[PDB]
Amino acid sequence: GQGQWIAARDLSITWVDNPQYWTWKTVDPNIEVAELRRVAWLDIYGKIETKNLIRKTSYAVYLVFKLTDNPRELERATASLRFVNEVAEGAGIEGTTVFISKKKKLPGELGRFPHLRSDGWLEIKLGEFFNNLGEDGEVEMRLMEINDKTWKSGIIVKGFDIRPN
Amino acid sequence: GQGQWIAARDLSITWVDNPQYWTWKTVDPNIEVAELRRVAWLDIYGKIETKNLIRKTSYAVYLVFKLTDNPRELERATASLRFVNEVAEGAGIEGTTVFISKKKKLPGELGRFPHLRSDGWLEIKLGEFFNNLGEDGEVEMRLMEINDKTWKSGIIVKGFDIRPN
Ligand SMILES: CC(=O)N[C@@H]1[C@@H](O)[C@H](O[C@@H]2O[C@H](CO)[C@@H](O[C@@H]3O[C@H](CO)[C@@H](O)[C@H](O)[C@H]3NC(C)=O)[C@H](O)[C@H]2NC(C)=O)[C@@H](CO)O[C@H]1O
Ligand SMILES: CC(=O)N[C@@H]1[C@@H](O)[C@H](O[C@@H]2O[C@H](CO)[C@@H](O[C@@H]3O[C@H](CO)[C@@H](O)[C@H](O)[C@H]3NC(C)=O)[C@H](O)[C@H]2NC(C)=O)[C@@H](CO)O[C@H]1O
Ligand SMILES: [Cl-]
Ligand SMILES: [Zn+2]
Ligand SMILES: [Zn+2]
Ligand SMILES: [Zn+2]
Ligand SMILES: [Zn+2]
Ligand SMILES: [Zn+2]
Ligand SMILES: [Zn+2]
């Protein structure tokens, strides 16, 4: 539309080119997607330049994904979205907890949950930013789960959708 | 309407009613501000309803403040901004590091620094959000430094300025 698509093949996904951990698959409609078999360090990362976007526009970034029959260790994860130039020296990723595989129980339950897209894929909002003049530099965003003690499994990554709000 | 102003009186500021830690003051034009004499738990918190705000608009939220001549232990602090309903159970504050008293000495120094406003007060951006249709509830925000080993001093809090980008 007036936004940008980053297909999974163009994201930075650690371990994604080692078949023991992730499997690249072609699926309808002739797209490549990345299926996580098992990983202890899950990091799905992308970065864009705001100089290329429409000015005076708020944008949201969404991870488009699916789950297998048996997702493991992915009830919660860490989403992050920031301007690269706003990272204080020595600060960490400093993200926010979102839900990935957990289903909203009762209508009063708080948190950011995924939901179904027109194309049958799920999406979770990683964050939002305002593009003023396209001069504030790049925006990086990721969904990660870097608990060394847990094997994450069963997410299928399609890409990042970047849409005007 | 077009954004919102939270006076210091309507922010939740820890210990602010204790004259050993904060000193309430009146300054031109007949406004009450909270001067920080000394505190170890610094927390300045405020909350708005998005239903009040102009719709389909991106909003930035700033703490408006000044520094005394000899501020203490305020080079950095933690900013947070989030939709109340998006906070997952058990999640902490999950904020970002920003600079308060530190001066941007390098043109290529990274981080959010304060900006000198038209009216001579400083402002620090706590966060940003898109208001769609006013149906996503409250937004909460804070600046805090809760290192129990340091005594913060020298910030004069005027209020929160919620403004369209
Ligand atoms: C409890 C325990 O040790 N479990 C083991 C897992 O830790 C281990 O997963 C690997 O963990 C290391 C960190 O401990 C990961 O290294 C990180 O890799 C990322 C991406 O390349 C890099 O950015 C980080 O700097 C790096 N961390 C450090 C500290 O250097 C590594 O990627 C994990 N490997 C996988 C496949 O997820 C697994 C597998 O060895 O075994 C557990 O028993
Ligand atoms: C002993 C030391 O190294 N430093 C002392 C400071 O810790 C102390 O400041 C007080 O610290 C406590 C704990 O960090 C603060 O209590 C917390 O207050 C928040 C807000 O009200 C509350 O939500 C927490 O539950 C509560 N935690 C606990 C464990 O009680 C307290 O607010 C701080 N007080 C002030 C005035 O900053 C100062 C002063 O007592 O002395 C240092 O020596
Ligand atoms: Cl780079
Ligand atoms: Zn959506
Ligand atoms: Zn409210
Ligand atoms: Zn210090
Ligand atoms: Zn909350
Ligand atoms: Zn200005
Ligand atoms: Zn909504």
Q: Which residues of B touch A109 (CB under 8 A)?
A: 89
What CA–CA distance (Å, rounded) separates A144 from A100? Answer: 11
- Residue A18 burial (CB count, 10 A): 10
SS3 B159: strand
Which residue of chain A has the CA closest to B56?
A165
Method of structure determination: X-ray
According to the annotation, is A140 in a ligand binding site?
yes
CA angle, residues A15, A17, A23, in degrees to nearest 5: 95
What CA–CA distance (Å, rounded) separates A27 from A121? Answer: 12
Query: Residue A18 contacts by C-beta under 8 Å, 6 or more apart in sequence?
Result: none
- Cβ–Cβ gap A86/B56 under 8 Å: no
Label the pairing between strands B76-83 and B138-145: antiparallel
Query: Are A50 and A69 contacting, i.e. CB atoms less than 8 angstroms apart?
Result: no
Query: Are A65 and A121 contacting, i.e. CB atoms less than 8 angstroms apart?
Result: yes
Taken in order of first residue, the domains within chain B and their CATH numbers are 4-164 (2.60.120.260)
Query: Are B142 and B126 contacting, i.e. CB atoms less than 8 angstroms apart?
Result: yes
CA angle, residues B45, B48, B50, in degrees to nearest 5: 150
Query: Are A157 and A77 contacting, i.e. CB atoms less than 8 angstroms apart?
Result: no
Label the pairing between strands A57-72 and B4-7: unpaired
**B3-37 burial by CB neighbour count: b if 16+ within 10 A, else e?**
bbebebeebebbbbeeeebbeeeeeeeeeebbbbb
Measure B122 CA to ligand 8 centroid, in angstroms: 9
Task: Kindly state the helix (H) or strand (E) to which residue B26 belongs, with its residue range.
Answer: strand B22-27
The Cα of A150 is separated from the nearest Cα of chain B by a number of Å equal to: 19
What CA–CA distance (Å, rounded) separates A41 from A140? Answer: 18
Q: How far is CA B111 from CA A85, A130, A162, B76, in A?
A: 6, 17, 24, 10
Query: Residue B5 contacts by C-beta under 8 Å, 6 or more apart in sequence?
Result: B159, B160, B161, B162
- Residue B119 burial (CB count, 10 A): 9
Query: Residue B105 contacts by C-beta under 8 Å, 6 or more apart in sequence?
Result: none
Can you give the three-state secondary structure of B80-144, one letter per residue? EEEEHHHCCCCCCCCCEEEECCCCCCCCCCCCCCCEECCCCCEEEEEEEEEECCCCCCEEEEEEE
- Cβ–Cβ gap B112/A88 under 8 Å: yes
Long-range contacts of range A105-113, CB-CB < 8 Å, 24 or more positions apart?
A: A109/B89, A110/B84, A110/B85, A110/B86, A110/B87, A110/B88, A110/B89, A111/B85, A111/B86, A111/B87, A111/B88, A111/B89, A111/B91, A112/A79, A112/B86, A112/B88
What CA–CA distance (Å, rounded) separates A11 from B88? Answer: 27
- Cβ–Cβ gap A89/B111 under 8 Å: yes
Q: Would you state the structure tokens that stand for residue A19, as one six-digit string?
A: 């078949």
Q: Would you state the structure tokens that stand for residue A15, as one six-digit string?
A: 């371990």
The Cα of B87 is separated from the nearest Cα of chain A by a number of Å equal to: 5
Query: Residue A64 contacts by C-beta under 8 Å, 6 or more apart in sequence?
Result: A117, A121, A122, A123, A157, A158, A159, A160, A161
Can you give the three-state secondary structure of B37-81, one letter per residue? CCECCEEEEEEEEHHHCCCCEEEEEEEEEEEEEEEECCCEEEEEE
DSSP chain A: --SEEEEGGGSEETTTT-TTTEEEEEETTTEEEEEES-BSSEEEEEEEEGGGSPSSEEEEEEEEEEEEEEEES-SEEEEEEEEGGG--TT-----EEEESSPPP-STT--S---EE-TTS-EEEEEEEEEESSS-S-EEEEEEEE--TT--BEEEEEEEEEEEE-
- Cβ–Cβ gap B129/A129 under 8 Å: no
Residue with tokens 């602090």: B77
Q: Would you state the structure tokens that stand for residue A9, as one six-digit string?
A: 């093949």
Breaks (C-N over 2.5 A) in chain A follow: none
Q: How far is CA A53 from CA A3, A133, A158, B81, B133, in A?
A: 8, 9, 22, 24, 23
Q: Would you state the structure tokens that stand for residue B92, as one six-digit string?
A: 């902490």
- Cβ–Cβ gap B85/A128 under 8 Å: no
Give the closest residue to B129 by CA, choosing from B63, B80, B93, B91: B80
Task: Kindly state the helix (H) or strand (E) to which residue B162 belongs, with its residue range.
Answer: strand B153-164
Q: Would you state the structure tokens that stand for residue B139, as one six-digit string?
A: 């937004």
Atom 5 of ligand 1: nearest residue by CA position: A148
Atom 25 of ligand 1: nearest residue by CA position: A41
Strand partners, A4: A162
SS3 B34: strand
Chain B contact for A138 (CB, 8 A cutoff): no
The Cα of B103 is separated from the nearest Cα of chain A by a number of Å equal to: 13
What CA–CA distance (Å, rounded) separates B61 from B113? Answer: 14
For ligand 2, what atom is nearest to the CA of residue B39?
Answer: 37
Q: What is the resolution of this structure in A?
A: 2.0
> Hey, what amino acid is at B116?
L
Query: Are B44 and B158 contacting, i.e. CB atoms less than 8 angstroms apart?
Result: no
Residues with CB under 6 A from ligand 2: B 14-15, 21, 39-41, 148-149
Residue with tokens 């900013």: B79
Task: Kindly state the helix (H) or strand (E) to which residue B24 belongs, with its residue range.
Answer: strand B22-27
